[PDB]
Design a protein around this ligand. Structure first.
Ligand SMILES: [Mg+2]
Ligand SMILES: [Mg+2]
Ligand SMILES: [Mg+2]
Lengths: 296, 297
């Protein structure tokens, strides 16, 4: 199976005067590349995929693909939907624009059954010839890809090679790798990056890496080299920032942090996302002071 | 004051035939709803597979609803929500143009807006049209919750926002809402607890069961609004089994299964990622249906 693993970043999407700030987007991708990141995830959850037009969706993927040419860095494009016809289109669309693989979130809101989830991903996987990584985040979608469904899709679809897990369920992560040890379990939850990696996970798709790519990159590769004492020691230092980056709904805290670090010009979201509370703004600022934030 | 749309309302299923919207079955079903005491129809809501319908099919179903309900008392409360505020504003203006009397606007799903964001989201929607706007809170589907304070603030600050459809299994919250803002129109979005919500001051239901048994849901709602709580509770108790079995799998998979079993739609067709039920739930739905008299056309 072709895979995309290692330290990966769910890229924020910076806005300037309500439009996508395309040059800062490219500049941020160069900061990830230069700090040990192995792949970037454009237009994911952290990238406010829900409020981007199809043209901006395309724009961010092509900026990501263009910026990563000549590097080892891959583009794992966000291309998921709660309508299978749309998800197939976004999958074919991300492939036609040079993405190395697609991250495909479980259908949100309309909550399909396991049989429906199977047919959903089977249709997506059969529409492209690039790796497909499942994305399970039940707190956001209202549904759960069961361990059995993930394993069947991994075994039945050639390009489906693993799953982003954002479920705070280390039991499920043991379930997955004990029954199907060939899948690429990817952590979608920064605080438990090390426990997932130490059980056989092969990478992270990180929110914290937007701000601290070098630390998330070092953590993952220490762990992949089975240097678990150095991986756990980075995981332990990151716990405070990992948690505070979710004091409000992601990506509200991480964009707040990027703005506080001077990495983006405007603290702009698209509604229904908005600036954090004045408290949470202050709490994020306080926790940031205990970390060294790389510049450009 | 405030313009309101209340009473017995149906979240219409959207029948498909050969992958297309059966517009001709759609009109027949709406005319079956009218003819059985329903006060309003909800096109392209959650039960209508709004997520897998194109914007053109969105228009088509709203239009059929507006046209089929012309000359009757039945209103059209169109589904017009999105997790992107710019899109929700567009769908709200869009629904007004096709004759909808009001809009049901689901809370932003997936992206979990904060309470502040939810307020600005709905304030933008309400200011874009001059027709009633009903909030829709279903946290099990959206991953977020419109708090009581946010609902009340929205009701008081925007003239088109007049209530909320509650699908949260939280009768405490419904007491919280009507005790602090008793002028609001609390609408039940949970068929099994239709009567408890109505007996606490709720002013209507937006029902899934009403697709199959519109006469029973209509009588239940009207009994309760006329304060005949013994007859309203008696229909609610009779409906409990079908109310639950219609959620043995994710709505609208069971209700469409029942509508097909009742011969009310031609094809048991969904749009992926929705699919036909398991073989066992097909049998369970069929068995529970047996105890109810299902009105025809
Ligand atoms: Mg180069
Ligand atoms: Mg090494
Ligand atoms: Mg320091």
């Amino acid at each position: 199976k072709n895979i995309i693993i290692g330290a990966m970043t769910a890229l924020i999407t910076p806005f300037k005067n309500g439009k996508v700030d395309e040059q800062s987007y490219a500049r941020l991708i160069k900061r990830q590349i230069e700090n040990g990141i192995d792949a970037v995830v454009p237009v994911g959850t952290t990238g406010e995929s829900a409020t981007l037009t199809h043209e901006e969706h395309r724009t961010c993927i092509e900026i990501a693909v263009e910026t990563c040419k000549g590097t080892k860095v891959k583009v794992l494009a966000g291309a998921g939907s709660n309508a299978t016809h749309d998800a197939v289109g976004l999958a074919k669309f991300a492939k036609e624009h040079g993405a190395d693989g697609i991250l495909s979130v479980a259908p949100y809101y309309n909550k399909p059954t396991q049989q429906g989830l199977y047919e959903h991903y089977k249709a997506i996987a059969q529409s492209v010839d690039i790796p497909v990584l499942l994305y399970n985040v039940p707190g956001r979608t209202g549904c759960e890809i069961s361990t059995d469904t993930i394993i069947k899709l991994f075994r039945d679809c050639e390009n489906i090679y693993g799953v982003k897990e954002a479920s705070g369920n280390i039991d499920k992560c043991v379930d997955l790798l004990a029954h199907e040890p060939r899948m690429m379990l990817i952590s979608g939850e920064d605080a438990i990056n090390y426990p997932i990696l130490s059980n056989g996970g092969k990478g992270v798709i990180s929110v914290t890496s937007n701000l601290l790519p070098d630390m998330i990159s070092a953590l993952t590769h220490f762990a992949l080299d089975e240097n678990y004492k150095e991986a756990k020691k980075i995981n332990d230092e990151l716990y405070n920032i990992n948690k505070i980056l979710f004091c409000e709904s992601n990506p509200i805290p991480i964009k707040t942090a990027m703005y506080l670090a001077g990495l983006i010009e405007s603290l702009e979201f698209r509604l229904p996302l908005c600036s954090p509370s004045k408290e949470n703004f202050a709490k994020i600022e306080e926790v940031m002071k205990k970390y060294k934030i790389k510049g450009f």
